[PDB]
């Protein structure tokens, strides 16, 4: 149960608005909704013939999250036929041709997330009020992109009791790189460290774009070793949640097609 949603984190890492950041924002919406346990992949055998990103979406819970955007998307998923991941994100981005679902596109997302951060007391209008949170998130990201052995840090917004913390961080990395806003938080690092970090993120993308994401693959970079072991330690918990993970890896697949 995190305080900040994935999309707000991504946007926060954004500043110091392209199409990439929007697409990635919607992607973060689907990812977050999957993480909550709201949506899940339909348990069909035929859908596994196509790509994971083309698989349908099934919503189980109807409880509101409190976040405006997420609840809007939930509403849109509540009154429609089961659409695929890529098509869902496309419709939420308004990239599909059909005018029947023209009202599916989210308008002025920037102001939504802005009011979201301000009302959370994170953003000040006059420019972040709390830089410790951003620095902590950045610390996690760098702990995944640089550290030899992956270790995690926790703040009040993202406690140690947060479920799928590693998954939250990985999804954050993938989503951020999808919008190419990852370049902002690699500026402090040295050249070689950047060169390792980017391709480490590339390995994360290539590994978790499929389900089940292979963990027998040994990285050559020596960066964030035992990632597979800790991910295994994550899948030891919450059994039967394979559906949501299929969704997530599907969105990761979408990020690699941008």
């Amino acid at each position: 149960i995190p305080t900040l949603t994935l999309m707000e984190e991504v946007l926060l890492m954004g500043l110091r608005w392209n199409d990439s950041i929007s697409y990635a924002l919607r992607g973060c919406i689907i990812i977050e909704l999957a993480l909550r346990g709201k949506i899940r992949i339909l348990d069909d055998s035929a859908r596994k013939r196509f790509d994971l990103s083309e698989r349908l979406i099934e919503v189980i819970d109807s409880s509101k999250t409190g976040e405006v955007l997420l609840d809007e998307t939930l509403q849109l998923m509540k009154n429609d036929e089961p659409l695929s991941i890529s098509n869902w994100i496309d419709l939420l981005s308004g990239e599909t041709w059909n005018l029947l679902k023209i009202n599916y596109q989210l308008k002025q997302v920037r102001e939504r997330l802005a009011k979201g951060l301000v009302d959370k007391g994170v953003l000040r209008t006059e420019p972040i009020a709390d830089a410790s949170c951003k620095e902590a998130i950045k610390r996690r990201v760098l702990s995944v992109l640089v550290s030899r052995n992956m270790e995690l840090s926790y703040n009040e917004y993202f406690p140690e009791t947060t479920s799928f913390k590693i998954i939250r961080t990985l999804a954050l990395i993938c989503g951020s790189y999808g919008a190419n806003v990852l370049e902002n938080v690699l500026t402090t690092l040295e050249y070689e460290k950047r060169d390792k970090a980017i391709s480490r993120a590339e390995e994360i993308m290539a590994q978790f774009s499929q389900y089940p994401f292979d963990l027998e693959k040994e990285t050559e970079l020596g960066v964030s070793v035992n990632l597979n072991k800790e991910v295994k330690e994550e899948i030891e918990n919450n059994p039967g949640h394979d559906l949501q993970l299929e969704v997530i890896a599907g969105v990761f697949e979408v990020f690699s097609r941008m």
Binding site: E95, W97, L99, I102
Partner: protein, 400 residues
């Protein structure tokens, strides 16, 4: 005419007949409709197969496309098949994030109009006119020959019309579409295989408008087919009954033009209203007096008898006889008189009167083909009666 498939491309949309070949390109650069060859047809890309194309509509700076995704079989008659548009789709060349906010309102209202609306058509047959009018027209022409009043997609195909005036290949692309009802029913009376059918079309135009149009003009046609192995021939009937407003503001010249058109197209006109001295034009009034339903039906019968006393005969309809292939053998009779129904408050009354009248003529249609005996009541047959009632009921469901 025939099915159409297309390819969606950023530069524009490329339409092409499903069955040389003409390609209808709507470019995204200038939002203009132009004709290209089969070589322009994209080798790869999404190929969408649709029932038919309604046409293009231009609002502000964008020109949208109105397409029918799928249709369901609603009627079959002498090989000719009637289709109802189940799902409609509006397609633009630009993405949803590129569409203007002002235009979104227009698309919203248009889509709202498309909802709760029943459209009907047929590839090999033009329903736009009555079977009487369709018989007076050769079998070759299709798009060129259609009623100006009931050709619903007239505006949407303006560009297509302009390109059809020059290119005959465009004629196959454009397909007549009507707003109302159109269905057939298979049955049997006195060991004779019979196929009933009903159509209903709403006019485009619009008391009396200055142009001459009266508004709310709904032409309701009742057609029939009867194959009798005893006579070795196929009989085809086409009773006709229009309705709408009535001249009672209303210009003298407008009334004159209206009546001239009505008398030129329908001949004699019996106008019945519900609560010059032209010889071929009669004015009838009727009040239900809030009686019971049965007494109301009786009153309808009495009104029918009154119309009969006015000079209206139940033998005045379109009767024809065709061959086994479909070609007509001989023309038996033509209808030179119609009964226009005008009502206050509830419109259902019009449908009721039209129904009882149509059955009163239907009995004579039966007698004319030796299906029933002289003086016999066809209404004694329960299945045919309830089929008739179901037909008119669904018609009433569609009109409202």
């Amino acid at each position: 005419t025939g099915p159409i498939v297309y390819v969606q491309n950023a530069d524009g949309i490329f339409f092409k007949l499903a069955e040389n070949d003409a390609v209808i390109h709507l470019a995204n650069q200038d939002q203009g409709v132009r004709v290209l060859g089969a070589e322009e047809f994209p080798v790869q890309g999404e190929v969408v197969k649709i029932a038919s194309l309604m046409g293009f509509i231009k609002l502000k700076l964008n020109r949208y496309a109105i397409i029918a995704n799928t249709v369901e079989e609603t009627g079959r008659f002498n090989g000719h098949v009637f289709y109802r548009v189940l799902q409609h789709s509006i397609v633009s060349t630009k993405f949803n994030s590129r569409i203007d906010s002002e235009e979104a309102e227009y698309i919203k209202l248009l889509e709202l109009h498309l909802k709760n609306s029943t459209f009907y058509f047929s590839y090999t047959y033009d329903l736009t006119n009555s079977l009487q009018r369709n018989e007076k027209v050769g079998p070759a022409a299709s798009w060129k020959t259609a009623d100006e009043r009931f050709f619903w997609n007239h505006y949407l195909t303006e560009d297509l019309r302009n390109f059809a005036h020059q290119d005959p290949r465009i004629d196959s692309f454009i397909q007549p579409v009507i707003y109302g009802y159109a269905k057939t029913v298979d049955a049997v009376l006195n060991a004779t295989p019979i196929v009933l059918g009903l159509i209903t079309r709403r006019s485009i135009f619009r008391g009396v408008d200055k142009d001459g149009n009266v508004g709310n003009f709904n032409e309701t046609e009742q057609i029939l087919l009867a194959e009798n192995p005893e006579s070795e021939k196929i009989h085809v009937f086409s009773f006709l009954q229009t309705r709408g407003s009535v001249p009672i503001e209303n210009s003298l010249d407008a009334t004159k033009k209206h009546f001239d058109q009505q008398k030129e197209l329908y001949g004699d006109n019996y106008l019945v209203n519900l609560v010059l001295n032209d010889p071929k034009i009669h004015y009838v009034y009727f009040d239900f007096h809030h009686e019971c339903r049965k007494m109301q039906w009786h009153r309808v019968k009495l009104l029918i008898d009154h119309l009969e006393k006015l000079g209206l005969s139940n033998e005045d309809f379109f009767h024809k006889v065709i061959d086994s292939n479909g070609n007509t053998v001989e023309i038996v009779n033509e209808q030179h008189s119609v009964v226009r129904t005008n009502c206050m408050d509830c419109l259902d009354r019009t449908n009721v009167v039209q129904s009882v009248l149509a059955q009163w003529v239907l009995q004579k249609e039966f007698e004319s083909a030796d299906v029933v005996a002289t003086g016999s009541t066809w209404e004694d047959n329960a299945p045919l009666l309830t089929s008739y009632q179901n037909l008119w009921a669904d018609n009433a469901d569609a009109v409202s």
